[PDB]
Amino acid sequence: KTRGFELITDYTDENLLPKRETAHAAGYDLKVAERTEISAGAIVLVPTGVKAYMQVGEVLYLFDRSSNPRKKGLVLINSVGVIDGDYYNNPNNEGHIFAQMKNMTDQTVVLEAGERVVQGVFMPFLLIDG
């Protein structure tokens, strides 16, 4: 056991466990855990149904999917989700990963359960002196 995703206790659909679309893709595609509506101009935390574990010195970044803005009118409003290794299994929400999405359009957008919403990439990070 090194790094990866697990379903949080609140979800049991293994379809939500992220996979890479191609053999050399950097990103794991996280999915919408339950139907989620986003009103015009609103920001909504979209549940992903999963938590992520990793090694010390590793981080998981969540990036928007390319098609979100031009096809769905949605953007990851904080640009990049920074998921720390100690978020996993925290006592507050078990490390459940949410995507903070904003609807840029003037009509309500609905994300169906199972739709891919962000891509996650695991990477090393470095520490400052001392």
Interface with a second copy (CB under 8 A):
1-5, 18, 22-28, 43, 45, 54, 56, 58-59, 63-66, 68-70, 75-82, 84-86, 100, 102, 119, 121-130
- Residue 34 Cβ, how far from a second copy at the closest point, in Å? 19
- Are the C-beta atoms of residues 118 and 62 closer than 8 Å to each other? yes
- Residue 112 Cβ, how far from a second copy at the closest point, in Å? 21
16-24 contacts, C-beta under 8 A, 24 or more apart: 16/48, 16/49, 16/50, 16/114, 17/50, 18/50, 18/120
- Residue 7 Cβ, how far from a second copy at the closest point, in Å? 14
